[model samples]
Target chain A: NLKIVRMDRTAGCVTGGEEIMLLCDKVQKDDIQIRFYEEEENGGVWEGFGDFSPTDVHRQFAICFKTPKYKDVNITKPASVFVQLRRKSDLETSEPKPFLYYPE
Target chain B: NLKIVRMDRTAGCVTGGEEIMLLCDKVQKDDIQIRFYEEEENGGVWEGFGDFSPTDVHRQFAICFKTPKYKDVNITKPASVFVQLRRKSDLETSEPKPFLYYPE
Candidate 1:
């Protein structure tokens, strides 16, 4: 089972590229991902992956990555979203955590 | 010699209390410290520490801790300081890294 222990910051600019420090349970550097997504009003979903390479996974327990841009660049208010730890190989996901994207 | 591989952020509010994620080489969970200090012109030093308990040290390679407050909380400009990993048992130190304390 995957888990996200904590994150340094849960809120960031919608323009993205803000770095985040995530603490988690053991994971494989090469086969894991940090995922961000939001459910739309139309039953659709918009998704983005946190930017990081294998080295960004520190000792299999922490990861450092930049936030991906939110779906709406022109949003004037905060967009509540979710972040999950996902496995690239099996597509397993952890319980989602709250993240907020505020205006740039 | 101790080593700090990288830090998520090097600039933070002068008033401190900002969390920083640090990646490093192996360290003992109960016998290490993160020191922040600056040399004074009068051949003195003002020092503070990163706040975290043993559990904050992950897999012997990463630590998540909060920044310590700077001496002059009202300073209007940025102050460049240094950070080092210190071993409690031997008092051994690593090469210092740059950290900036900006106005709140």
Candidate 2:
């Protein structure tokens, strides 16, 4: 139960690796996972992960991750993040996608 | 015989409207088409076309385009172009891909 059928880049570079091509739908190339979180309005929270393996998935819809590292790598402008598609065995998610971060 | 399966930016800008996120191999969103060509070592040839409509093709395997304006927008460096997937009715093609055009 996942979706996200678009993403060839939403913006990148905040000390992250930069390489994203996701176009998903049928995950499970090893349980899926591509989280890049952050939600701090005083409740603070941040997470990262998307540097794939499992052959970078592909026939399972698509995914080619790499881009994670942005918890204030100096933040000088453009920031805003959220990505999802978790489920490493029931963590189930995928209803977020808005990644910006750009302060290189 | 269409197969391009990859492309999320191979470089852009030469006044071309920069947006490319093709991932193909199954087209027919009204008969495909996305050609941007150039081949001149003096044998000259140049073509361009990659806008998008038909809803930008996304269910026929993805294809959000834009980038079709390079044939000397006053070039000064980097220039390479070639893209494929054409078949507006038996013109079938594919096996090209390679785009670059920096010098905006």
Candidate 3:
């Protein structure tokens, strides 16, 4: 099973344009997918915003990519979202990790 | 003990200037400090570079701050650093979390 041990940088100030590095354990390049999610105002359920496909920057245990430019809602203050890893070979998603999105 | 649950953004591209948000559990606004560290080229000991004092933006669950401008060595490629939290009340520091410092 694949798992995300931790990230290199745990949080970032989000203005729709930033690159984040993700580190994980027991994974390979070109065989994984990532899903990004955000919670609603009422905070009942998580909403899936988009997915990311890794590029050549991905290594066996580390990958680097650019975050999406926007969220489903208008982000006025600093907030957090969910990130999960999926292995393409079996199509299983790892547990989600809370990632922060901050304001200017 | 204070624990860093996770960061909103897990990795970043660092060019000596970027603000990062840190998320943790069971922390106060004015009772915590953060230290940044990088591994030496020989990759043996972790060197302490500088420390950060949180500001009013700190909450019980989250805090936002700017990462240090540079490392002890010139960062030519993407790298990882250590981020550990300290509590002033007991002078106890949490285990270090790996943070990514990237290149332009």
What is the C-alpha local distance difference test score of candidate 3? 0.61
User: Candidate 1 vs candidate 2: which has greater TM-score?
Assistant: 1
Write candidate 1's Cα lDDT for A28-100 as tens digits: 9999999999999999999999999999888788898999999888998899999999999999999999999
Deviation from native of the Cα of residue A11 in model 3, angstroms: 17
lDDT tens digits, residue span B45-77, model 3: 654422345552333545555566544336688
Predicted candidate 1 versus true structure: per-residue lDDT over B1-104, tens digit per residue: 68998898988998878988888888999999999999999999999999999998987888989999999989989999999999999999999999999988
Global lDDT of each model?
A: 0.92, 0.84, 0.61
Indicate the worst ten consecutive residues by lDDT in candidate 1 chain B: B15-24
Q: In candidate 1, residue B29 scores what lDDT?
A: 95
User: Which parts of model 2 have CA positions greater than 4 angstroms off?
Assistant: A3-6, A10-22, A26-36, A39-82, A85-91, A94-100, B1-12, B15-19, B22-33, B37-45, B48-59, B64-69, B73-85, B92-104
Models sorted by DockQ, best on top: 1, 2, 3
Cα error, residue B92 of model 1, in Å, equals: 1.8
TM-score of chain A of 1: 0.98
Candidate 1 vs candidate 2: the lDDT winner is 1
